[PDB]
Design a protein around this ligand. Structure first.
Ligand SMILES: [Mg+2]
Ligand SMILES: [Mg+2]
Ligand SMILES: [Mg+2]
Ligand SMILES: [Mg+2]
Ligand SMILES: [Mg+2]
Ligand SMILES: [Mg+2]
Ligand SMILES: [Mg+2]
Ligand SMILES: [Mg+2]
Ligand SMILES: [Mg+2]
Ligand SMILES: [Mg+2]
Ligand SMILES: [Mg+2]
Ligand SMILES: [Mg+2]
Ligand SMILES: [Mg+2]
Ligand SMILES: [Mg+2]
Ligand SMILES: [Mg+2]
Ligand SMILES: [Mg+2]
Ligand SMILES: [Mg+2]
Ligand SMILES: [Mg+2]
Ligand SMILES: [Mg+2]
Ligand SMILES: [Mg+2]
Ligand SMILES: [Mg+2]
Ligand SMILES: [Mg+2]
Ligand SMILES: [Mg+2]
Ligand SMILES: [Mg+2]
Ligand SMILES: [Mg+2]
Ligand SMILES: [Mg+2]
Ligand SMILES: [Mg+2]
Ligand SMILES: [Mg+2]
Ligand SMILES: [Mg+2]
Ligand SMILES: [Mg+2]
Ligand SMILES: [Mg+2]
Ligand SMILES: [Mg+2]
Ligand SMILES: [Mg+2]
Ligand SMILES: [Mg+2]
Ligand SMILES: [Mg+2]
Ligand SMILES: [Mg+2]
Ligand SMILES: [Mg+2]
Ligand SMILES: [Mg+2]
Ligand SMILES: [Mg+2]
Ligand SMILES: [Mg+2]
Ligand SMILES: [Mg+2]
Ligand SMILES: [Mg+2]
Ligand SMILES: [Mg+2]
Ligand SMILES: [Mg+2]
Ligand SMILES: [Mg+2]
Ligand SMILES: [Mg+2]
Ligand SMILES: [Mg+2]
Ligand SMILES: [Mg+2]
Ligand SMILES: [Mg+2]
Ligand SMILES: [Mg+2]
Ligand SMILES: [Mg+2]
Ligand SMILES: [Mg+2]
Ligand SMILES: [Mg+2]
Lengths: 203, 99, 51, 148, 193
RNA sequence: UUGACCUCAAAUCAGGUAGGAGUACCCGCUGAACUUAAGCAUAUCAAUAAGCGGAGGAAAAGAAACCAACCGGGAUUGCCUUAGUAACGGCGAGUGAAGCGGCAAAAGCUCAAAUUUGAAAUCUGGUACCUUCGGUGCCCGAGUUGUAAUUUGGAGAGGG
RNA sequence: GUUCUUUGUAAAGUGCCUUCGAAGAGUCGAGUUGUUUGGGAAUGCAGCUCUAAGUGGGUGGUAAAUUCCAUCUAAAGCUAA
RNA sequence: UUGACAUUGUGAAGAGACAUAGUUUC
């Protein structure tokens, strides 16, 4: 199959043929609207290991988001409290640009369900992503044992809740000593270790 | 191994009649394979070398194999990868512009 | 979260119930407790399993 | 119960037992463990010498268990044998048929030597021993058998 | 705020802790609830028991390896030896664990024996639907308990080879302690030009 | 001249879908100061309040890129414990988890990466009929820039 | 429990021999900045710059070079109590 | 405000090295 070649070819992003390619595409996308419907995946090998399928009900969307830090809003940089909180300008934002990308298209296609998304390009100002989506009212999907899970209401806006692959990353859901803090879900486990538990027969 | 049967020292621990289990194929998640070998070989020669890889084989020729690692170490993650990277360019060099 | 229940040592607990069982003999005690047992055959008053 | 509580006894007196002059105010000392090195130092040194500063080495990710190793003294030792079974061994201090005692099985890690076992053979299976315990054990015709 | 000869305390109540007090008034309730669930599962689950066959397993770490404990499931090995595939064993009320491994023969056999007893002490009804009602034993756990293996005998002959336990410990600890130094002396002298 | 294709549009085009509300509990973002330190800035209050986006009857987590260092264990969640401990800390005030053990409940799995290539074997829709949460015939259409079968690392595949 | 159609020149399970055994990239990882954490020469998260490999890769709670060993199999997914 | 790196590509003359072939850098 050709997908193995595509996969390998794509890890050579500074190879000559690839940065010609990167160069021409990144100008074209940037011309088009910030969110625009993609006609087909430009990385079909990436799409398809990430859940995509060539049948009606599957959708691709290309979106770009600004790069760099999060400038803390606040009029004139004024912070009105303690010095530890006086920063404004080296402040970073706990979600990935990919998450912003997912969220902004998911909103644009609220009949759809975000399934996953993948990086395709960047310059100094934007990162470019394609988001692979599924339409859970499409009968082709509503059948399909493998995908129709996406049809249940627990999966409305997974991107808004940190349940897509990026989201699970940033929430830091992983097994181990490295993830004690966030893992069962950080606020949840905080609440746990900070709940006072009293028995009828006091222990 | 064999454990000594006491509670300190070299092969500290309980003596148990041993078994050694069938190998797990997870444990071979790294192995090459003919298909990958072929495809990677082919891609390489399709697409050529990246900028830092070129700066690399120059240094190897013109400054030795130790300055090469030092730069490659800064470029890549770390030292072990630079080891393998220099090592790889070394064999591009041999295989090609030589024997 | 006021303390509503109370722990009692299981053994001290039994000491008590035993003491109480013991005292259900002792007619004076049963009399003093209310309980109209002057006209009963004997104490402990044991009746047939037919009950 | 409130019934037996001194505040019942203080109703009708002005200051509730807390003084007309000194009063009962919110936090004169400061709060909690404040003043430690200043207005509360006489009480800290004295009653708590050792409080401030550091000693030895930090140990990151210390797993208590590593060091699990309860001690049992010869003191006892025979208690690890059930008493009915026990009287039988005392009488017939004997090679060829001496009691086995798996101290690890009983949940001890080391045997120590507090004091005088009878002059009767024991076979003692343990992970560690003090030099002494083994000595005393041996002087009764017994051995330590090192397990794990 | 420091006075008398009192021990120094650490009562962590500086957050809005009253917003997070769970007092289990529902102990008795949950118990009832919990029991009802079991009566229900039992009834739904026809003659099956309420649990799966679990293997013996020696527990981890220096502290508990004395004891033996119910495992998760049975290792692809143990099942194979007991004359059945795992896909079936799963439908017969036996837990199987693809990630446990056999390094210990004594435990391995124990687990194979556990399986032969189970197989012999169950009956498995024909798929058809003849359903020859057979009364449920509720606990695979109670039916096939797990005992600690007897490791010796009460009494025995004393043998004293002479060389003491204490010094062996000491020496044993020592050899390890200097194992590398001694090797560096072995290396450094190997380069005897 | 006629017919495709790619990309892009338009219909009050055939059928659908999102918005708002609620918000105890839940998944995220963003984010204080009062306060405590007997002053105070790091610290603390607090990864709390207020502000924002998103779900359900629970949610989230989940079949190990885990824990261990044992004679090893074996998805996740919770309780008892670990422990006011290891550790963090103007090492001040203060803070502070995890592995083992017992217990509640238990359950396991599918994709991607493979030539069906002696036969796209797959699917939306329209339509006619029927025994209508659906089936069948037919016709447009999707789809080879890959829709089915097969395989998921515990394995597994091809020949014998 | 009953009854009606056999779904099949269908589908699945197991033993031996041989050859194979594809396994997720602007990711892992690294520097730095900021935040956060009990996590201490850096616990997680994120920004910018660098950016892998395949007997490889991650982890092994003191930075580093060397040599081993142990243990999982990331960067895709569903799931009752 | 100032520097570096990324956005960043293509020729030409002149400098800069393996130390008076052209890969590389100003
Ligand atoms: Mg389309
Ligand atoms: Mg403020
Ligand atoms: Mg700060
Ligand atoms: Mg630009
Ligand atoms: Mg924490
Ligand atoms: Mg109490
Ligand atoms: Mg009181
Ligand atoms: Mg009272
Ligand atoms: Mg009174
Ligand atoms: Mg008075
Ligand atoms: Mg008086
Ligand atoms: Mg009075
Ligand atoms: Mg008075
Ligand atoms: Mg008073
Ligand atoms: Mg007064
Ligand atoms: Mg005064
Ligand atoms: Mg007071
Ligand atoms: Mg202190
Ligand atoms: Mg004592
Ligand atoms: Mg508390
Ligand atoms: Mg407070
Ligand atoms: Mg309640
Ligand atoms: Mg149960
Ligand atoms: Mg039946
Ligand atoms: Mg219409
Ligand atoms: Mg809403
Ligand atoms: Mg805050
Ligand atoms: Mg307050
Ligand atoms: Mg103050
Ligand atoms: Mg004050
Ligand atoms: Mg003030
Ligand atoms: Mg803080
Ligand atoms: Mg709020
Ligand atoms: Mg609802
Ligand atoms: Mg449900
Ligand atoms: Mg429930
Ligand atoms: Mg769920
Ligand atoms: Mg797995
Ligand atoms: Mg577990
Ligand atoms: Mg100080
Ligand atoms: Mg303190
Ligand atoms: Mg805190
Ligand atoms: Mg348990
Ligand atoms: Mg299942
Ligand atoms: Mg993988
Ligand atoms: Mg930092
Ligand atoms: Mg923040
Ligand atoms: Mg940090
Ligand atoms: Mg190292
Ligand atoms: Mg293991
Ligand atoms: Mg999937
Ligand atoms: Mg899920
Ligand atoms: Mg400039």
């Amino acid at each position: 199959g050709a997908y193995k070649y595509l996969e390998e070819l794509q890890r050579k992003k500074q190879s000559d043929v690839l940065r010609f390619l990167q160069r021409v595409r990144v100008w074209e996308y940037r011309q088009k609207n910030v969110i625009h419907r993609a006609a087909r995946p430009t990385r079909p090998d990436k799409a398809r290991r990430l859940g995509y399928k060539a049948k009606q009900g599957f959708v691709i969307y290309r979106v770009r988001v600004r790069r760099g830090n999060r400038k803390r809003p606040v009029p004139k940089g004024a912070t009105y409290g303690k010095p530890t909180n006086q920063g404004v300008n080296e402040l970073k934002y706990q979600r990935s640009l990919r998450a912003t990308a997912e969220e902004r298209v998911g909103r644009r296609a609220a009949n759809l369900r975000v399934l996953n998304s993948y990086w395709v390009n960047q310059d100094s100002t934007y990162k470019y992503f394609e988001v692979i989506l599924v339409d859970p009212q499409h009968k082709a999907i509503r059948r399909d044992a493998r995908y129709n899970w996406i049809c249940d209401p627990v999966h409305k806006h997974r991107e808004a809740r940190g349940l897509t692959a990026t989201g699970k990353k940033s929430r830091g859901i992983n097994k181990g000593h490295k993830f004690n803090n966030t893992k069962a879900g950080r606020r949840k486990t905080w609440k746990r270790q900070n709940t006072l538990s009293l028995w009828r027969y006091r222990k | 191994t064999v454990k000594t049967g006491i509670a300190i020292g070299l092969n500290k621990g309980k003596k148990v009649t041993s078994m050694t289990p069938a190998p797990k194929i997870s444990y071979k998640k790294g192995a090459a394979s003919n298909r990958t070998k072929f495809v990677r070989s082919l891609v390489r020669e399709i697409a050529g070398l990246s900028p830092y890889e070129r700066r690399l084989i120059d240094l190897i020729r013109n400054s030795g194999e130790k300055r090469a690692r030092k730069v490659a170490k800064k470029r890549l993650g770390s030292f072990t990868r630079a080891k393998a990277k220099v090592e790889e360019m070394n064999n591009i060099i041999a295989a090609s512009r030589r024997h | 979260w006021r303390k509503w229940n109370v722990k009692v040592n299981h053994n001290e607990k039994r000491y008590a119930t035993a003491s109480a069982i013991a005292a259900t003999a002792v007619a004076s005690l049963v009399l003093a407790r209310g309980h109209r047992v002057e006209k009963i055959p004997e104490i402990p008053l044991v009746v047939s399993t037919d009950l | 119960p409130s019934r037996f509580t001194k505040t019942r006894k203080h109703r009708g007196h002005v200051s509730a037992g807390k003084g007309r002059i000194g009063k009962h105010r919110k936090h004169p000392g400061g709060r909690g463990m404040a003043g430690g090195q200043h207005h509360h130092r006489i009480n800290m040194d004295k009653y708590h010498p050792g409080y401030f500063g550091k000693v030895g080495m930090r140990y990151f990710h210390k797993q208590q268990a590593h060091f699990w190793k309860p001690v049992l003294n010869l003191d006892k030792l025979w208690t690890l044998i059930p008493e009915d079974k026990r009287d039988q061994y005392l009488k017939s201090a004997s090679k060829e048929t001496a009691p086995v005692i798996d101290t690890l099985a009983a949940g001890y890690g080391k045997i120590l030597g507090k004091g005088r076992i009878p002059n009767v053979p024991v076979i003692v299976k343990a992970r560690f021993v003090s030099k002494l315990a083994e000595e005393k054990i041996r002087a009764a015709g017994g051995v330590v058998e090192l397990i794990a | 705020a420091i006075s008398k000869n009192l021990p120094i305390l650490k009562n962590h109540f500086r957050k809005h802790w009253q917003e997070r007090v769970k007092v289990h008034f529902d102990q008795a309730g949950k118990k009832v609830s919990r029991r009802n669930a079991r009566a229900t599962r039992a009834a739904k689950i026809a003659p099956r028991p309420l649990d799966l066959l679990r293997p013996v397993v020696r527990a981890p770490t220096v502290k508990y390896n004395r004891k033996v404990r119910a495992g998760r499931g049975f290792t692809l090995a143990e099942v194979k030896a007991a004359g059945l595939t795992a896909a079936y064993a799963r439908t017969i009320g036996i837990a199987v664990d693809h990630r446990r491994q056999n390094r210990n023969q004594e435990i391995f056999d124990a687990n194979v024996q556990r399986l032969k007893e189970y197989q012999s002490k169950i009956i498995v009804f024909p798929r058809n639907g003849k359903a020859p009602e057979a009364e449920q034993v509720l606990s695979a756990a109670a039916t096939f308990p797990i005992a600690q293996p007897a490791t010796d005998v009460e009494a025995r002959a004393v043998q004293d080879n002479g060389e003491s336990a204490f010094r062996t410990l000491r020496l044993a600890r020592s050899e390890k302690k200097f194992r590398g130094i001694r090797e560096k002396r072995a290396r450094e002298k190997a380069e005897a030009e």
